Every structure is written in structure tokens, then in C-alpha cells.
Design a protein around this ligand. Sequence first.
Ligand SMILES: [Cl-]
Ligand SMILES: [Cl-]
Ligand SMILES: [Mg+2]
Ligand SMILES: [Mg+2]
Ligand SMILES: [Mg+2]
Ligand SMILES: [Mg+2]
Lengths: 224, 222, 212, 196, 196, 195, 195, 125, 222, 204
Amino acid sequence: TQQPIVTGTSVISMKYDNGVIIAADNLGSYGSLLRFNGVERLIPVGDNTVVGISGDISDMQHIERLLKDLVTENAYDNPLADAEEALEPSYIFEYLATVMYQRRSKMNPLWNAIIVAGVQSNGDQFLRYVNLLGVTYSSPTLATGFGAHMANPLLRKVVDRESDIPKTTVQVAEEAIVNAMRVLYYRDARSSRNFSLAIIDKNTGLTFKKNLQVENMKWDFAKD
Amino acid sequence: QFNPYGDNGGTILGIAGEDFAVLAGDTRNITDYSINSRYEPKVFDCGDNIVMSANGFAADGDALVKRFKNSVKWYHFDHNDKKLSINSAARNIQHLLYGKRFFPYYVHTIIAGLDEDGKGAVYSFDPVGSYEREQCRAGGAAASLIMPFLDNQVNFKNQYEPGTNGKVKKPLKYLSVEEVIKLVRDSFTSATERHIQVGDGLEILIVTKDGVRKEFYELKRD
Amino acid sequence: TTTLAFRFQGGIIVAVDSRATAGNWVASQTVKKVIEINPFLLGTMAGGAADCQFWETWLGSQCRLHELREKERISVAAASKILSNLVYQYKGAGLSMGTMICGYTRKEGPTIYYVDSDGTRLKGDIFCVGSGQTFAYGVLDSNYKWDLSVEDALYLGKRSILAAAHRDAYSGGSVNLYHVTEDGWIYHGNHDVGELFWKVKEEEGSFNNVIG
Amino acid sequence: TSIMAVTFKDGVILGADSRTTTGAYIANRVTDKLTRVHDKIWCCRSGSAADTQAIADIVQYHLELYTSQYGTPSTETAASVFKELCYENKDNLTAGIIVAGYDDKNKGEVYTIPLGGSVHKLPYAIAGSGSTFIYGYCDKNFRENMSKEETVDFIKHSLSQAIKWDGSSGGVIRMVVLTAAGVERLIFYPDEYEQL
Amino acid sequence: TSIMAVTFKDGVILGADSRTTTGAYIANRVTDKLTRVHDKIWCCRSGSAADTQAIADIVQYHLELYTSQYGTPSTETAASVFKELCYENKDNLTAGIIVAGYDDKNKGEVYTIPLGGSVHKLPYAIAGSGSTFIYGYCDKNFRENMSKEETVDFIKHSLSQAIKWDGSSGGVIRMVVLTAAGVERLIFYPDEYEQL
Amino acid sequence: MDIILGIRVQDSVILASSKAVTRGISVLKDSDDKTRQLSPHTLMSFAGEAGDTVQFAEYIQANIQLYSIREDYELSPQAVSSFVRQELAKSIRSRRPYQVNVLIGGYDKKKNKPELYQIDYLGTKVELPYGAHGYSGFYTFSLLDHHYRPDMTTEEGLDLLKLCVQELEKRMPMDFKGVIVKIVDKDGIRQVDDF
Amino acid sequence: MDIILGIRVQDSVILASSKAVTRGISVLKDSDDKTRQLSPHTLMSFAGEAGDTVQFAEYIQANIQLYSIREDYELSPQAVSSFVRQELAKSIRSRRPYQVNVLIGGYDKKKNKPELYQIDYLGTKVELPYGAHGYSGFYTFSLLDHHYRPDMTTEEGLDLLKLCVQELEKRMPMDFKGVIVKIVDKDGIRQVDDF
Amino acid sequence: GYDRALSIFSPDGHIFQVEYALEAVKRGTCAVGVKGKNCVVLGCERRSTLKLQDTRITPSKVSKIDSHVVLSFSGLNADSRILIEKARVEAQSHRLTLEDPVTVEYLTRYVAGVQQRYTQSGGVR
Amino acid sequence: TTIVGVKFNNGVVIAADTRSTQGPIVADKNCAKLHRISPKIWCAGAGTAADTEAVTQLIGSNIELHSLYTSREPRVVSALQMLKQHLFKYQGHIGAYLIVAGVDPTGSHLFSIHAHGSTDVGYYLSLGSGSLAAMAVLESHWKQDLTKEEAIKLASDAIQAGIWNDLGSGSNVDVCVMEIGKDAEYLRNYLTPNVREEKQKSYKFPRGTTAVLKESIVNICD
Amino acid sequence: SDPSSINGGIVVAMTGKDCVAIACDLRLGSQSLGVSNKFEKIFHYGHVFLGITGLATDVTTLNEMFRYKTNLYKLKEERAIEPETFTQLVSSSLYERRFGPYFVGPVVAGINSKSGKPFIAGFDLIGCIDEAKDFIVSGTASDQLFGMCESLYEPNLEPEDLFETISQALLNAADRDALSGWGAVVYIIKKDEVVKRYLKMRQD
Ligand SMILES: [Cl-]
Ligand SMILES: [Cl-]
Ligand SMILES: [Mg+2]
Ligand SMILES: [Mg+2]
Ligand SMILES: [Mg+2]
Ligand SMILES: [Mg+2]
């Protein structure tokens, strides 16, 4: 039994025609205090996977170490560690999902909501969610916390079902993600303006963007 | 305090015919008032012509299915590739569930297939392993909406022969796969209308001696 | 649940309902609450469905192992005590069971043991167990004699379940009858309350509280 | 909330953020927490939105009725009415109010009224959840008899920090200037104040 | 507690008040919250006095054993040991620790470890109950590559305000300077810092 | 308090009510009459919270007797039962409700019919051929479902009642010290002394 | 469970134990023997938590019988009572204690004296001329304080016991369905069939 | 714990430790059992190189396992006490769970099972 | 519920979905959440359904009497003041969450009221369980100087966001447009994007299927 | 101790072609104990029919209250109250007890005598009107009734067909609820004739 201390808010993501996009702000909240501002909550694993984590940051840092160790262990006695036997997004997810559900079953959970975004070896987009309860699900768009309530509706207007994915470009997808991040800054009381964004494309690979800012905001007051 | 359980909503439904059995379930997955996925399947082919669904808390549901699938694998290894009969699968699942009697899998489990005489079979479980073979069972969030409809339309309950003064009951007969799928679709559209956790899509797995077939239908997404 | 079993001149009658409930939700109307342990032993189920079902089939396995090891069918006393000693180990953990172990052996004759989840084990001639036990007792006690015929005893057991099925909201479905003799148990059919009630009302003239 | 009021040479300035909060959800990001109870007597509202509005409405009614009979009320009088309501209904209220007004005799005055309903006359006052983070800054930077431009910069910088650290604070920085000249409303958007 | 550690040109300086509390009673007004875990790796202690001492003692033991086998440990290594204890025993600990040390390669480094047991490497860190009141001040006044005298003034002014507003903080301001030159202890009494 | 029963037969209503008054681990009395005559052809038995029962019974009795004097007329059993129900229906939303359950047995002289009404402390009224309050019902209802006939005589009703008391004496945990039996018919109310 | 009594007279110990087994609102049995013979001249009655009682009684019985076979000798009532006390004294600080109260009536053949021991679930042992467990004592102790004499015969002890049962049947709230009476003397243990 | 396999097979397929245990039995005083039409009689030799014995208190050669079964033996006296004790405990345990005293066959089967266990357990002879 | 309000050029528009729930069950699939306080002042209500209807009728009643008393058309701020003081008096126990909008001699107005009695002003607002889905759309697509047709589109789009993404909201979209100088136009079921598909089967029973014990004519006349 | 599920019971109403149907079970119990199998839950005031589920004492009280109020209505108005008007009266009366409510689930059914339009409506325990074209459900088996009605119902059923649909809806819903059943009554209502039928159902 735990209670989360230093926390991270929404992680948002979606599929597009050639890959997946994922984003998360750089804030480490301490209750109502917006304590830490240089926190990276997107962690790449290899050149084909990005794990976005919300919830308790001490547990996030533990998960970082686990993923880091997983890369090391996979390389051992593995001549094809950078080829056919490289870590897939599906392997990384299932590992985390196993851990999350085992920890909930021991009544000592990792207080997190996690989204694993990546591209498989055959070019297929991978996007799946797992949380402190061990609950897993997949969808064209996935989001945690406030993102689930405010981002998903916006991202679902772009990709509402499976057939919309081939029709969605990386430009359109990134635009929707960046817009969603702005909306979260307007409305989530534990969000920051600064955020990171990652694109995993089956052609251009992993593009990791740091120090992005929410811009072009409106602040008008009605009369009465 | 940490609460290890959650409710992922959705509903499932199993019907057995003479030489077939269906196991249906909506594809919506939820927490509270949010939709997690519009298409997250929870009815699975487990091999040996057994289909299974464990509806309720998805994490427990997935764990159970995963363990039973594994049980089928080891049953082959240990007993010379022998086919696991539906009755044996049922009993095995009882022990899986009751094994966690004091920290239960929060799921209503239904399996479907064919018995050793080739006839359609549906078995249903409570969260701690009590099981029973039936012609008919709905499980999950909208079970209370669907089940009485099934009593009326599958088992012809409260239906008497016209003109017989309520003395002669409507006789029991097996339904064709076409008739059964009509009832499944109507059951799920009705459940979608009146239950908020039910909708998005319907996935039906049909089991005959030839194998396992799938059918998908859209449901209302509101 | 309503379950009963009583001893009489011609052996043992065992009668049970078939309803399962989750609160006010009627979960099933076709539950098998009698388990056939061997050709001479019966077990009744009341309380937790899984608890009863799981441990009473387990009991059957322990009885089978006894006759393999001892080359002799287990006594009703020893069979009931395996179950009672088992549940006593789990006392406090939250098991919910009200069971009756009924059967015949040469050394014992017809015998009924009441076993429940707080470890109580009682030999006796008459027991009614379940949420509708009191309703069954009312009818059974007021019509019971030792010298009942096999035909009358079967009816009284059936009629007692019907009485409880009617009044107790958490009892119903159908009646399952059993008769236990020196030659073993004999099944006397499933009797749906849907038809049995009106049949009994008309033929017996009882149930005048109900709109005919 | 983060709110403050600061006296200076020509009068007094009130300042506030614009965020209203139901848990971690921002129910209103363009809230006006600076409220008129009289021509040149205003207040900053913190605590319950419902409570503070109901109080401010009653006070405005009292001062309107006061004015009809006895002419313009003092800022002290206005603070007394706020106190009377906050003190006598302390069990049923969550309201941290700063009262600020301009007389010609008394110039700029600031009265703060915390949860208990006590009154405290100060040169400047800070209140609301976000005020905790700027006690150090405000104490070190406040001077008496500042100019209008200096006081505006003091409030802007102060609330900027309060907003930066308090998740319950944010949006724009609204201000109200109270002088002999009249009443001036000021607004400052994130793009400006964030990068101070 | 009010505690802080600040990196600067020549290394790093740790700062702390001297108050230990049991409720509103000051159990020790001359507490030393700046503790040596290695020659030039020190920590600031906040939270439970018992927990933080027990942790610091274990860490000192680990680094002594580390030094016997592998030579001088890095400041990062020291922070990792603190984290390991704080994270794995999070349910049974109340310890907010700031770790600060001087390498010759890495110069001055500061790692803060809050309640959960997470690690955060920063240019400077503030912690303890009194830190809340100086987030505004410290953010506005901190610069990178300050001189020794500037950094001492920054810590002195900051903790002065933290002490002024936090009832749980007070007494003297102790500081520890970590540079290539060595280890220097500084103390500042109320009469000096109060009237800043 | 505890056991109160009622059986309506062809020409009469029979009420049986336990004699025991228990407080703690002591049976304080074994000859308690848990009934009041509301009018010459109307009898009310009662069970429930200590004090409340008699206080309520006598309050109703006073009101019906007041009515009888004012109008020089006897209220029908149906009218009395409705009055009692309304008083209990008021009571349940009072500051302190009457926790009293009652049976009302009466003979309607205008209809020449016996009538039995079961009313609980919530004000839940039902007309029944046979009635019971508390745990008694869990045994007697099923018993009466089997043995009761609508055309029975008063003597047959008493034998049917003996069968109920015997069952209760066998299976009830507490000693309720037998019952006082009273019959309500065309000739009024009388007590059976040897039961 | 509920009522267990014990009376030590000149030449014997008499134990009386209620026959009722009640669960909920149902008396499941009215002929229950709440006693076990530990040895030929030692008898133990018991009352308390369901299941625990018989499980404990039979566990003690097995241990004493084991002792008897090993040593070809009968333990004194004092020795048996001390063994039982220690088992209960262990039990009370276990994860789940035995909630069982016992009386031990025995005839010491070496001393030619009857002995009655009262032991509660905590392991509180006392030797007494007369004993009771549960609410029974609240009536019987004062009664026996008045009527008991140390030199009474077995017949006088039975009449004294009849006086206790009568009082309990009059003033106890619950129907305990009479008692099974057993006598322990120089010739061993025997049951009185007509009580 | 002491683990050594003391009872093991030899090249010819004998377990010498079990066979040498039989030699200890051969050394022991003679014991005989004869059963009649309605009884069984157990006879036992007692060697007479021991005068000045106290026969009141000296362990008897025939032991009661329960009130209806008896056990006599030949071989090591100290070893026999361990078997008798275990048998007596099993006798009471059987009565407790089965609610019936042991059969002579069952009691024998138990004692024989104990003896067998000591032929393929580590650290024991 | 999802409800919204949006200001435009020459007036204001409000909208709402048409689902009412009890727990996870849909009680009414087409309820009216748009209320008339006065001819040109309309209210959208979320929360406790009986409370929103009752508080809207009471203030509407008092507003009519006030309009007759003063010989003036009622103002939105009067309804706002009366509603907020009523709700405040009851300390949140009257669970009415309202979006009040309308036109009057002073101009066009848009406010929201919470159950505890706090009021907000805005060009765009959203309340109810689907308010986050709606507000996300409003924050994305709202701009200054909206036309009538643009504001209706934005309002209904914001309601749709709730319908699809919030399980609390569903069925249809109601709209009411209040323009200055014109009559308020109430657009009941402005959108109906959740029409039930044709059922697979007719469940019309053969006459005589139901067993009957007694028949009798019921007298309704005097 | 949940007031709405102590006694048990159910009511359902449906509309057809120029007709309405309202049905209810007959059970009155005290939790598990069935007490009465004659407890009707449908009442009428003129041509307007009202069914009430929930706590039985409040069912009785409200019937008596609405008889009271409709009788005075008729005396002053010199005409019978209509279903639309009566629905409003029910809502007002329930909301009057906002913070001390009657624990009931009333259902109005009837045909407007002027317009000829079939009308049904439902309420929560505190007055919220739920109007419906098709059907209204209430009671301890409301979930079941919702499922039965949603699947079985079709618009514009003839009185004889509507009887079969509403009866089968109630019966099969009641048999999946422990606290409902023990008999049933169905009212078929046309413009100027009303037929009342008692259904044969399982008595467990
Ligand atoms: Cl506000
Ligand atoms: Cl210290
Ligand atoms: Mg739906
Ligand atoms: Mg029933
Ligand atoms: Mg902020
Ligand atoms: Mg039913």
C-alpha cells in the first residue's frame, strides 16, 4: 500500500499512417506545489520504442532502471542484439505489464499509468496502455489522467477508428497532439507549459523533441 | 488506501445449439465514465475448440485466460497431445479460480464449445469457481438486462401453447445458428441502448466441429 | 437455499431446491445442490456456492482414496469428519457452508450428519439447512412420523421444499428428490416449482393464501 | 488562489490570478477575483467561490444602503462589514478576503481578513494558497511610498512567482488601481509575466 | 526544518537552520542538520530526526566500505545510496535529504531526495517546511557561477526569510563550504541575519 | 414481547400472543397479556420495543373508545385498521418513532365477516387469512400454507393454532412461556383459559 | 451450547449439561451430549464457541487416552485438570484461541474423594463444591449457596440439581431443552436416563 | 542435517544394513505368537543370566498399543520403544478422525511403513 | 450530462445532450435538459434531475411575476441572482448545475451556476460529466466574433464530444438560439446521430401465449 | 435497511395503438419473508392510472394522498383530472418532500379524454418526471424490465398484442428477481373500456 508523492500528469499519444506519436510535459508536481520542472517523462528504449509514464516519479525512475537493465540483459550472448533479436515494443510492454500486475497482486503497486509507443520489426504500429492495477488496453489514441478526458476526444476527431489511421499523416497527427497539450495547459492544474514529444516512424525512425512550449493562447473576459 | 480491483465494464453472452455454440462479447473497455478502447477483444480461442471470456476486472480476466491457455498447453505435454474436453476444461478452471478463493479473480467466466458427444456446450463460473453447464448464460455489466430475455427466447420460459388454458408449455427445441445470432445481436443492441458501459462493437465466436469462426458487428458508440 | 434430509422407517429422504442468488439477483434456477459422492453417500449444499461445490467434490476424492487404501467403503461418520476437520482448519477465514452428509453403511445403518463452516458436526434424524430452513421445518415437523411409507416420505420432503420455495425469496427453482436405502441412493427426479405448485394446490387444496 | 493588495504613494493596487479550481480541473481560467463593493472600495477573493461571492454581494448591499443614508463609507467601515459576516459565520464559511480602498483623507488602505474573521490593517497583504511561496519575496521587495509603475511591477513579479509554484493559481494577472484619478483595470498575459 | 544546498564557481555550499521540534516545543535550538557522509560529500537533513540520522549513519558506513575497496566515491554514487534506502523503505520513513559534494572532475553537485525516494540533480535545492516560503525568493535571486561571498549571501538571505515565516525553523544559520581548498564551517547568529 | 399470531377462519378471528416478558437474562413475567380491546368486536395484539408497545396500544384504545362514545357507534375493523396504520405511518417520520408491530382481529357486524389485519411499525397494512409478526412467521406461514382452509370452524382454527405453537416450542430458541388465545366473533371477544 | 453445571457431594461428582444446539432462529438438536469421558473415572463437560468445543474436548480426550495406554495407569483428576488448564493457557495467546469453557468431574481412586474443577477459556482453574459456566451461574450459585451441604448423598445431589434446572427453566430466556445428567464416583461414570 | 545414505544396495543386490538389522533380531530373545479359534496368545522368552531383576518395574516384553491390540518383538529393546510409541499415537489419531479403533491389519501396516521409511531415508539406520 | 453555452455576434446559444442515467442504466433516452425561465431566457441543467427542473420552474415562476410587477421584460442577471441565492441558501444540497443564457433590454448574456451558488461569466462554458470532452472542443475551436451558424456548429460539436466520449452523455443534441431583436428558437432534437438500427426479429407473440387466471371489466365511470 | 428494497415489487407501463397498458406484481414481503400475495400496486383516479413501487407504507400513503387531492380537484374543477395534469401533481407532491422523501417509484398511465392521446410517465422518489413514447419501468427488477422492454417492445401494438408483450416483459423480469413476483396484474386501457387480467406465474 502506497501513496504517490512526486507525480507526473497526462501522457498522450496516437497512431498515424507510418508510426506513432507520444507526448508528456516536463513537470514533477508535489501535491499542489509545482516542484520540479526539468523532468523527462518519455524514456526511449532502443531506436524503436518510447515509454511514456505518469504517476509517482520515484516509481518512474525505478522503471527507467528496469528498462535500462533490460537492454543490457538482452545484449548478453546475443550477436543479433542490434538486428533480429533487438528489443521490440511488444516485448518491452509485456514485461512491464507483467511487473505491474505482479506488484498489484502483492498489494504494493508501482503507482503509475504507462503508455508504450513504438514500431514493430514488421512495420506495424504499437500503442498500448498499462497502469498500477495491471489493466491493459489498446486504441488508436491513448491518454492518461486528464489526457483521457480532454485529449482523447480531440485526438479521436482525427483517428476515430482503425480505418482512419492510413488517412492520417505525421503533420496532421503532430498538430493534434500539440493542440491537445495546449488544451491541457489551459485546464489541468498540475500541467506545465514545457513538454517533450516523440515520433517513432517506420521510415525515419525515432525523432525525440525536447524543450517544446505551448504557444498561441487566448485569454478574453466576457462583460457582466 | 490502495484498491487492487477495478471495473472495466462490458458484457458477454453464451448460447449453445445442437451441434454448435456461440460466445459473444462487446468490444468496449471502460473505467468510470471514460472509454479506454472501442475495440479491445475479451473473447478468446484457447485451442481444442474451447472459447473463453472472463468479464469484469480486465487485469484479472487477462491473467485467468492467460493461465488457462497455458494449462491447455501443458495438458498436451503431460498427456500425449490428448484433446482437453469442455467438461475437463471447466473443472480445471474451477481450480484456477478457487486457488485464489481468498483474493479472488474479479470476473464472471464463461466458456463454450462442444461436449464429447458433439453437442453444443456452455459453462459459466462465479468469481471463486462455482460452475454449471447451461444452454444459456449472460455475464457482465448488462447480464441483468439480457438474461431474462434469454430465459424467454432460448428456454421459452413463461410461454404456453395458445388455446391450451396455460396447461401445455411451449416445447423446448434447439435453435439454428442463424436464429441464435439474431438473438445475440438483438440482446446486445438492447443492452447498448440501456447500459452506458455497453457499446462500440460486438464480436461473436462461433464453435462447430470444423473450428472457430468470428463475426463482427458495429454497435452504438455513445 | 433450502435443503433437508430426514431419517425414517424406510431409510433416508433427501430433498433440496435449485436456486442461486447474488443478493436479490436470481443467478440460477437449475443448480445441483446434491452431490453424489458414491453409490451409498450423498452430500447437500447450502451457503457459498463455490465453497460447497469445491470442497464436497474434494470430499468425494478423499472418500475414494479411503476405499483404495482400506479396501472398504468409508463410513458416514468418517466421511463427515473429513469435511468438518477440513473446514475447522479454515475457521475464521470466511468459508460459508451448511452441509449434510447422508448415507448408509452396514455398521451404521442409515445416518445423517450436519456439518457447517464454523466446525459444528451433529448426528441426527432430521435437519433443515439454508435461508429457508425454518419454512421447511414448519411443514416437515408437523407431518413427520417415523412410520411414514416410502411414498409418503418422498412427498413430505418434496412438499417441505415447496413450502420454503414459496415463502423464502432466496429459495426456489425446482425440487431434487433422493431416497437412500440399504442398497444405496435412488434419484426421484427434478420437479419444477412452476408446475409443482399449481399441481399441489389443486390436488391438496392447500395454498389458499394465493389467488387461485 | 493567489491574491494581493499593495498601498503606494497615490493610493492602492489590488492584484489577483484568474484560476478557479474543482480539484485538479480548472473550472474557470478567466475568473475575476477583484470585486467592487463600492466606487473606490474593492476586495480580493480567496477560498470558496460561492461563499466569497455571497459575502461580497451582501457587503455591496450594506454599503449601498450606507451611502444612501450617510454618504461615502470609509475603507475601515467596509472591512468591518466583511469582518462581521466572516466572524459571526466562521463555522460555515471558507473565505479569505483582502479589502482595499481609496479615501482622499486616508489615501490607500489595505485590510486583510483571514479564515477566523479577524481584521488586520497592513501596508500590503498577500493571501490565497499561492501566497505561501512569495512571503520571502514580498517581504524583501516591498517598500512604502512606491510609485504606480513600481507597485505594478511588484505585484506582477510577486503573482508571477506565486503562479509559477502554486498549481491552484494561474491564467492571467488582473489588477485594479485605486487613486484620486479614478479606477483603472489592468491585465497581464502569460507570455509577458512567465518569462520575468 | 529549512535547508538548502547551492552550487557555485568554486564548488558547493550547504545551509541549514538549527531547530528541532516536538510539536511547538523546541527540543534543540542548536541542532546540526549538516552531516558528513564522506570527506567532501555532505547532506542536509529534514523530516524525522531519527530516520535521517539512521539513514546518514548507514550511508556513511557504505561510503567508508566503498572507499576501502574502490577509492573516493562520486557525489552521484552517494546520492544513489541515499535513494536506495529512501525508496525501498518509503513506507516507514519520513526523510527529505539534500546531498551535496565536491569532485575535482565534476566540481560542485547537488542532489535532492524528497519523501518518495526519487532523485533530482539540480543547480541548487531547497527543502524542509520553511522552504515553501522562499521558492519565490530563491528562483528570482539564484544565478549560476556565483562567487563564494555571493553564494553565502544568497543562502543567508534565503534561510533568513524561511526562518522568519516558518515557526518550525529558527536558531542559528549553519553552513558548510565544499571546495578544492577543503571544508569550511560557517555560523550566523540571529542578531545578524534577522535584520537583513 | 416476541410472538403474536392471528388466524381468520369462517366465522371468527383467533389471536395468539406469547406470555413472556424478558429483560436481559431474566424472564420477569410469564402471564403477560399482549392485547387490548379497542371496541366490543375489535381486538389488537402487539409486539416490539419495550414501553412503546403498551403506550401505543392504550393510545389507540383511548381514541377508538372516544369515537364510540361520540358517535354512539362502533367503527368497522377496516376503519380501525386504517386509523391505526395512519398513526404508525405518521410515527415513522417522527423524531422518535413507535417501534410497535400489531395484528388487528375484528368481526364486521354489518358484513357478518371476520377480518384480520397485519400492520408493522412502518405502517404497512395487509388483510390476511393468517398473520404473524417477528421470527414467528418464518415457521408458521409455511405451516399454515399447508394446513389452512378458508371454511374452517373456530375449533378447527384452534387445532391449527395448537400446531403452530407446538412447532414454535420445538424450533424457537427462546422460551416464550406459552400463549394467551382470544377469539373474536359475532358475539364479541372471549378468552380461552385452557391452552 | 450454554448451560453446564457441576455438583460435588460426599461420594460423587454430578455433571448436568443442556441438550439444545441452536444456530440462528432454529434449535437444530435437542439431545446433544456436551461431554467426553477422558478416563474411566474422569468426565469433562464443555460449552462455548461452535466447533471449538467438540474439537477441544476430543483433542484432550485423545491425549489422556494416549497417556493411559503408555503408562498403563489412570491420571488423577487433579493431574488431568492441570493438563487441560495448561492447554487453554497456551491457547489464549495463540493466533486463534479455543473459546471453550469446561468443567472436569472426577473421582480420585487413590484419595477416595470426588473432585470438581471449573476452567474457563483463559485457563482459569478453580476446585469447587459446585460450579457453572455462562449465565447459569447467576442463578445457580446463590441457590446452591443456600441449599448445598458438603455431606450430601448422590440422591440428595440429584434433588439439589433438579432445583437448579427448575429455576433455570423458569427464569432463563432461552429454551435449552433440559439436561443430560452424569454421575462420577468410585465405580466410574454412568448416565441418568430419566431426568 | 546428517544426510548420509546408510542403507544402500551392494553389487549382488542386497541392502546390508537391513540384513544386519535382521541379525540383531536373531540375537534377541525368542518371541512366539499362536492364534486359536477364539483367541491369540503371545509368548516371550526372558533370558536368565539376569538375576536380582525387579519384574514389577522392568519393561514388559508385550506392549498394549490400544485396549484391543498388543505388540511383542525381538531385537534391540531401545528401538522397539520408538515403534511402540508411534503405534500408540497412531492408534489414538485413528480413533479421533475415523471414530473407530484401528484394525490389527491397519496398525501393522503403519508400523511396517515406519520400518520401511528407515530403510531409504538419509542419516538413519 | 453534457451541456454548453456559446456567445456570438448578436446573441447566445446553448445546447445539451438527451441522456438521463440512474447508475449505469439509461433511464430516459430523450429527456429535455433545456428549460425556459422566460420567453428569451433559457437554462441548461446538469446534476440532480429533479433539482434542475424544480429550481428552474420556481425562479421562472417568480421571474414571470416580477416581469408583470415591473412592466418590464425579465433580465438574465435577475434569474442569475435569484438562482444563486436560492442554491447558496441550500449549501449545495440542491444539486443543480446550470448554464443560464438569454437576451434582454441590456443585451445578450451567458452565465453558469454551481450547486453551492457560485456564478461564472464567459463567452463559452460547459457543465456536467461530459464537460471536459466539451471544453476540450471549445478550447480548440472557439474564437472571438463568431456568427450565429458558427456558434451553433461549435455548440453542437462540443455536445457531440460529450455524447461519444462520456458514458454519462448520449443520444441526441438539443439547441436553443437566443438572438437580440428576435424570438428565441428552441431546436428540440437538432441532431439525432444515435438512431437504433432495425432489430433482427419481431418478438410479437402468438395470441394466447400468456396464461391467464381471471378476467374482469374495470369500471372507470361514475 | 434500504427502504426501496425491503418490501419488493415492480410496475411497468407501455403504449400501443390508441391504448395503454400498465402492469404490476402482487408480492409484499419483509426482505426474504414473503408476507402477502394480494398486494396490488396499481390504483386509479377516474381514468388516470397510477402504479407505485418501493416502500409499501409510502405506496399506501401516496395512493390515499392522490385520492384525496384528485377528489378535491374534481369538486372544484367539475371535471376528471387528465394524465398530463396528474403527472405534474405527482411531481409537485414528491418534490415537496425533497429532504425527507417518500421511498417510491411511481408510474402514471392513461389516455387523455380530450385529445385521445396515450400517455405514460415515470418518476424518481423525489419528483423528476420521465416521459416516454414507449415504456416506463419501476421497482426492484427495473434492470430486468429495462432489458425485457427494450428488446420485446415495438410501436403501435394492438391492445391484444400489447397485452402479450407487457405480460411477458413483467413475468420474465420478475422471475430473475427474488423480491418480485408472487402473482401479477395487467391493465389494458382503451379510450372508454378497461380490462384487468390476473396472470398465472410461478409462485417462488
Ligand atoms: Cl468567483
Ligand atoms: Cl538531529
Ligand atoms: Mg451504450
Ligand atoms: Mg421464493
Ligand atoms: Mg500554476
Ligand atoms: Mg421471483
